[PDB]
Design a protein around this nucleic acid. Sequence first.
RNA 1: CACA
Length: 160
Amino acid sequence: SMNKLYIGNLSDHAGPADLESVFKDAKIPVAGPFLVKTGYAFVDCPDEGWALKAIEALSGKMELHGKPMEVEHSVPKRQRIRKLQIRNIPPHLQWEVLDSLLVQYGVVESCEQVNTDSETAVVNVTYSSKDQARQALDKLNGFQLENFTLKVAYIPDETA
RNA sequence: CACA
């Protein structure tokens, strides 16, 4: 499931209490403890919708000890293969236009809308190959359209 | 992005 979070760009004295207070103030419940390492941490949310809420609310936006936090789906290294999630999609972007961007980097095996509270849309995309998804991640992340900047990240590819 |  996609309820696991990676928390990146942490300060050298950020501790579980700091992170606990960040997630409390944004009213994100968590299902377990914060595991804080050197410069990064992990936490579980109760389900997928809360995890996405935390990403959309905190990642690139919340500053802790004067550093912007990265909050992203935790993805094991070896499971960064065909699958990506695209965030910050313009609310009225026709799917055909989105598709015309995706296919510039490979064959789309599936593109699923992820229902969300935000104004912006979210899709999960499976390319046919690791190389295609890498290219799409590199070229779509940061792309500006209709006054929004796409955010693209890996999600676990557990079957490739 | 976790591994003595």
